[PDB]
Design a binder for this molecule. Structure first.
Ligand SMILES: Nc1nc2c(ncn2[C@@H]2O[C@H](COP(=O)(O)OP(=O)(O)OP(=O)(O)O)[C@@H](O)[C@H]2O)c(=O)[nH]1
Ligand SMILES: [Mg+2]
Length: 167
């Protein structure tokens, strides 16, 4: 009944598509096929209401045309990989142009640190928690491989959109 337009953004290879495919199909895509742009719809129950989720899976390095889908989107899943410091530093550039394009400091957003199943972490959990708090947004650790945190990342974004509409 309620439609939510979600956009997954982040650097190349951080796991945007794998996180999206886990939510929708409950399988882990281990092969890496770089995305140009895919979108998916899923009906799911979150906190007792049926939600229609429109999920836009974006490309890491874009060709910019971010603005068109950044204006249509209501919530943004900002994804970095915990073994890629650069992808974590890229987060503030993603948030800056979302804020610019939507012309607001209060945009529904969730910070996602993906690939937490790997033993080669270079971005600490506390680092991300502090960046999240400085933005005033949730932070969720995930692994598309084991599916840990996957529903929570998307559902938490739904709830950030739900709060923004009910301010
Ligand atoms: N170990 C591990 N590998 C992961 C995880 N998530 C993604 N991968 C792998 O990392 C690679 C990149 O994953 P994608 O989901 O395709 O990357 P992306 O962010 O969609 O990348 P672009 O579409 O190119 O922007 C693939 O080989 C995935 O199988 C994870 O949680 N753990
Ligand atoms: Mg992809």
């Amino acid at each position: 009944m309620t439609e939510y337009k979600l956009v997954v953004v982040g650097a190349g290879g951080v796991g945007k598509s794998a996180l999206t495919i886990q939510l929708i199909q409950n399988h882990f895509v281990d092969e890496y096929d770089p995305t140009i742009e895919d979108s998916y719809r899923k009906q799911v129950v979150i906190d007792g209401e049926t939600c229609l989720l429109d999920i836009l899976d974006t490309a890491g390095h874009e060709e910019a045309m971010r603005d068109q889908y950044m204006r249509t989107g209501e919530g943004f899943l900002c994804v970095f990989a915990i073994n890629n410091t650069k992808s974590f530093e890229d987060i503030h550039h993603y948030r800056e142009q979302i804020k610019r394009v939507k012309d607001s400091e209060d945009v529904p957003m969730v910070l996602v640190g993906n690939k937490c199943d790997l033993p080669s972490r270079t971005v600490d959990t506390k680092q991300a928690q502090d960046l999240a708090r400085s933005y005033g947004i949730p932070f969720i650790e995930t692994s598309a491989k084991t599916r840990q945190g996957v529903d929570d990342a998307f559902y938490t974004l739904v709830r950030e959109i739900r709060k923004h509409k009910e301010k």
